């Protein structure tokens, strides 16, 4: 006979990091809405991160992002069409620059979602990080309206918190969007409004920078008669509320006792 | 259904070509499975007149004297070879379709056969080779090349769906084409009738089986071969011409989906009776088969005085005796509408599938009998010099079709098109509909031949296919889905994630039939299947599987036979049936195991399969435990039940040796669980930051006592501060009581907000010593390391 | 926007045929060679867990899920039901008695055939690229009023493959659905909506896509065959 | 402002633009199923580690770092994994560990890397003694991974 209750061979059992899980669900939610996930580079030029997004230098608007500037020769930063690009290098302060990279390399209409690691120079506490993730959304084409942006967030909220969930839209400022807005979702289980991110209708000047970069590259203009909306939300906070993580610093902490607790979420 | 291009062209003269025809029909809803050219006629085949047929003494052959321009002789053994008919003469030199060598002048039983008269098979126009082709003696000037009156033909093999029984007639097809814009030429039924009484009566004893039944009367018939144009037509459609009258009934049937049969009056007696058949009543059908009828069978019977007899199987096949032959002079023409269900059962009952049963089963135009009588009677007058009565015997009064609703607006709304109202209505009218009204919702009543036109939707499809499905634009819908459709895909996603993890963990997926061999309930030792098949593919698949593992085992064997896998780790997910349909997950382990391929030591068998499963459940974040339990199909020594989150969901163990033997297989390990597995909601636990207290201790216990109880006991008493607890060594030896075991346990304690005092850890091991002894167990180790 | 939901392999004649406007003893039902079942003690659960009765069989297609789903939900919605189906017929190199189908059902106000064509076009694009195209031809199914059969152009192989059938949900299907609802206490939910449905046979698409010559390989269980697909993650 | 959802056939060149992202996520998932545990480490590197870990110095540096230990951008993924093993062994005492991490590395060009770490007694019967571990064990998992991906895998010295 054999003790069938004895532990078997200690084969290893793996797991996915909580941000991977939260990113995966966010991506699945938007995939169901027609969005496709594309990524951008963590090291960007000032042109894509700021200038092309209507965020010029020495202006109050740029203070909304504490940049991490870089130095070093020999580094080749590829642009939207593999062409080598130049400009003061930095660590992207948000995923937004992919809005520009994508649009020069493609034609409307389309729906994309860009997840990604972003960086910001600021002190890290229990609810703040200098290194975190964002999920960008961009939908462009004839007749795209803000009603559609609200429709997207409503679907996001429903998928994330259920039918007793709701979204809230309030005016807020971003150089890359003309109506500008900030949105929150009602979390029933916790009976409170959490601010998810910012969004708005793509600014006129963003489309212009996009087509100007296209012209300077031989491509024909593709965004003169289209509108669109974009949004950007910060993954960690959503993940924290969703997995009951109290300290945002745990994410990059590397502690196995922390990571292991998420194997169950397949 | 065979569609002879030139025949269809007779109704639709403007047809562009067979290819364009195929395209038109496809857009109408009729797919052609094949297109082919069929009547090769060499120059050497000429039309001849049989002046005389002389028997060759001592043989079963005849010497034919033919007028083929010049007189010639040919030897023939065909029973139908006789004076007064036209034949297909293959002159010496002619090369015939299919024949190896040419046709030459040959000496046969004393006579020089100058070529030979042909059968449909030899000429290549039909399968029949039992007799010569029979043409009218004046069909063509003697000696004229046959091809001149018999051009090659292109025939389309059309698929005609159930909903379009009217399309089982070439004229019906032509009407669909007409709607597309083609000119339509309907045959004019020139008839010179006579006001005379019919020398017979009609008695429909079963109006349920024959809702509409008519009888035509044609006399003074001159039975003879059908003209060349008709024989070409019938042969092209896959039918063999017989003669004047018979061919006309087949032709009209193929023209307008209206089976009809000519009954020789000599056998009708006083009248025709459409009635049910009487138990065991015999009937020799047209095919020569002697049959016995069933009381549910509708028959066409005659009667004489007190005599009642079957003449034919109504709507399926006529009787052999009243077939219409050379000496026939008058007939009763049957044109009717039978009950589909009735015809269906009868056809099956006698294993008969005929051009007639097929059409009546699909449905015939309820008010087409009378028009069909004119057509047939008309052709009979023209080809058999028939004399026809002005009156018909008619029973039944079918009601015309009712008006249907029709909103243009809805047609466009449902299709997503924007066809102008006028085009929609012009289309319905070309198809033969009546359109009444002015307002937005018209009153459209379809022609009786359209059994498929009853709902407004039906009418929109008429508009769509006539306009052409290609004219329907492309769009994508947009809408917020109704609230209760939320996360309705969770279950499916849950299972697919499981398969993916399993494939990553190392298991290989397999797909096995849901069928089970009834006999395996025995071979594999398990309750018999609850669901069986009334009509199985084979006795080895007469039941529905109750378990997944049996199939996996049979897969291992089949694999080991074809190829020699040295091992294998498979898995399969599928539906099992037993009181309720449920989803199972089963896995199989076989081979030497896992280890260094160039070395010797290895990890395999039971504990290996248990390793993978523990990894799987660790990966799923679910509690997994295996307690020993007996299972007939498993080895009594290596057998246990599987528990996930404290809930029995399956079994794990080695295949029973006895079963292994009967199947001629080495040891096999496996498991089977019921899906979906339990869901363990997250409950994040903030890991303590303070140091953890380490401490070992072995436990002396009887060999029988399962590790599970020990682990459970130690853990339970270990205290609210127990973090870890692992088994690092099992020893059963001399240092202590014989027949005992020692369990090496690595333990760890830890506190959430502070550190553990050296006393608390002892107070904890104490409970693990008191409750440990209370169970008759002792502890050798008591400190770390 | 479609969500995947599954149905049971063992169905009642009601869902597989009757509710789908396919009555008994009619030519239409010949389009599916059924595998009838026998056996007591088996409990067949309906759309709302209620125990249901009726002659049991092995579903001849996924279509019955159209009915199960609609009684258990409210429009508008988009579903896709994959599943093992069974048919009594001889198995050769390109035919199976056991195979899989993928059903599609989209219902709601204003749903038009233009939307069904739009769906297949997207299917073709995603499956074969931009040089791909779809073809729609009239065909018959009791559960759909325009009825249709669709094919997709496969550039790489330069030929049209017939993928499946589709159409606008028949009026009577919506009626059977709401009638079953009423008989269950639920309010009618499909009187003012339209919709389209489609069903395509997986094996054939897989064969053309993975270059599998013999459809019998799928249920063959041969590891040398199965193993060749580990690469497709 | 009302709520709506847009509808349109996406422009042809947006086709399968998500293949890359999907490809990588499938890889992570397989790795998690094969047995590897995912870890997330900062993209920052300690300039001094180019020495401690023996490797070419980082090509990109930070003008305004958070600290001197994070004044450069990582060139490799493994250094961080090792420092993770150590930090783990200090707080807790993992008897072993099979980790993996995917991330952006910077050196002449930004590129994505996949790194894995193996440590501990190995794999075998927890109540027995014999075991499979170290090099050939890590090579086992990798061979399984590539077998699962359907890719040829070879390791030359
Ligand atoms: N220090 C931090 N730690 C964790 N999350 C942060 C931190 N700073 C911000 N976030 C998250 O980042 C999200 C948005 O970042 P902001 O810097 O506030 O906005 C942006 O980054 C904009 N690019 C978003 C955007 C995109 C498109 C159109 C309009 C607006 C917030 O909702 C928040 O949850
Ligand atoms: N013996 C077989 N082996 C492999 N595939 C088969 C077999 N018989 C059919 N199929 C596949 O099954 C697909 C459709 O099956 P059919 O029986 O022809 O139709 C149906 O089964 C319908 N229920 C489909 C449908 C759904 C919704 C609306 C309209 C029509 C075909 O396109 C074909 O690829
Ligand atoms: Mn129709």
Number of H/I helices of chain B: 19
Main β-sheet, spatial strand arrangement of chain B = 27-31-32-36-35-34-33
The Cα radius of gyration of chain B reads 42 Å
What would the CATH topology of the largest domain in chain B be?
Answer: Phenylalanyl-tRNA Synthetase, Chain B, domain 3
Q: Approximately how much beta-strand content do the residues of chain A carry?
A: 25-35%
Please provide the ordered H/E string of secondary-structure elements of chain A. Answer: HEEHEEEEHEEHEEEHEHH
The CATH class label of chain A is: Alpha Beta
Instruction: List the bound ligands.
Output: adenosine-5'-[phenylalaninyl-phosphate], manganese (II) ion
SS class of chain A: alpha+beta
**Subunit arrangement of the protein:** part of a larger assembly
Share in β-strands of chain B: 25-35%
Number of domains of chain A: 1
Q: Quick one: biggest sheet of chain A?
A: 7 strands, mixed
CATH superfamily of the largest domain in chain B: Phenylalanyl-trna Synthetase, Chain B, domain 3
Family (chain A): Belongs to the class-II aminoacyl-tRNA synthetase family. Phe-tRNA synthetase alpha subunit type 1 subfamily.
Protein name (chain A): Phenylalanine--tRNA ligase alpha subunit
Cofactor (chain A): Mg(2+)
Subcellular location (chain A): Cytoplasm
Q: Can you characterise this structure?
A:
The structure is cut from a larger assembly and holds 2 copies of chain A and 2 copies of chain B. With 266 residues, chain A is of the alpha+beta class. Chain A has one domain (1-266): BirA Bifunctional Protein, domain 2 (2-Layer Sandwich). Chain A has 7 helices and 12 strands. In chain A, strands 1-7-8-12-11-10-9 form a 7-stranded mixed beta sheet. A two-stranded antiparallel sheet of chain A has the order 2-6. In chain A, a hairpin with a 5-residue loop joins strand 9 (167-171) and strand 10. In chain A, helix 3 (97-105) packs across helix 5. The longest helix of chain A has 16 residues, at 146-161. Chain A is globular and about 80 Å long. The two termini of chain A are 35 Å apart. Chain B is an alpha+beta fold. Chain B folds into 6 domains: 1-37 and 154-186, Phenylalanyl-tRNA Synthetase, Chain B, domain 1 (2-Layer Sandwich), CATH 3.30.56; 38-153, Beta Barrel (OB fold (Dihydrolipoamide Acetyltransferase, E2P)), CATH 2.40.50; 187-400, Phenylalanyl-tRNA Synthetase, Chain B, domain 3, CATH 3.50.40.10; 401-474, Phenylalanyl-tRNA Synthetase, Chain B, domain 1 (2-Layer Sandwich), CATH 3.30.56; 489-679, BirA Bifunctional Protein, domain 2 (2-Layer Sandwich), CATH 3.30.930.10; 690-785, Alpha-Beta Plaits (2-Layer Sandwich). Helices cover 25% and strands 28% of the residues of chain B. Chain B contains 19 helices and 39 strands. A 7-stranded mixed beta sheet of chain B has the order 27-31-32-36-35-34-33. In chain B, a hairpin with an 8-residue loop joins strand 38 (722-731) and strand 39 (740-749). In chain B, helix 6 (244-256) runs antiparallel to helix 9 (369-384) and helix 7 (340-349) packs antiparallel against helix 8 (355-362). The interface between A and B is large, with 36 and 49 residues. The complex binds adenosine-5'-[phenylalaninyl-phosphate] (FA5) (2 copies) and manganese (II) ion (MN). Residues 31, 61, 63, 87, 89, 95-96, 99, 101, 103, 141, 144, 162-167, 197-201, 203-204 of chain C line the site of one adenosine-5'-[phenylalaninyl-phosphate] (FA5). Chain A: This is Phenylalanine--tRNA ligase alpha subunit. Chain A: Tetramer of two alpha and two beta subunits. Chain A: It catalyses: tRNA(Phe) + L-phenylalanine + ATP = L-phenylalanyl-tRNA(Phe) + AMP + diphosphate + H(+).
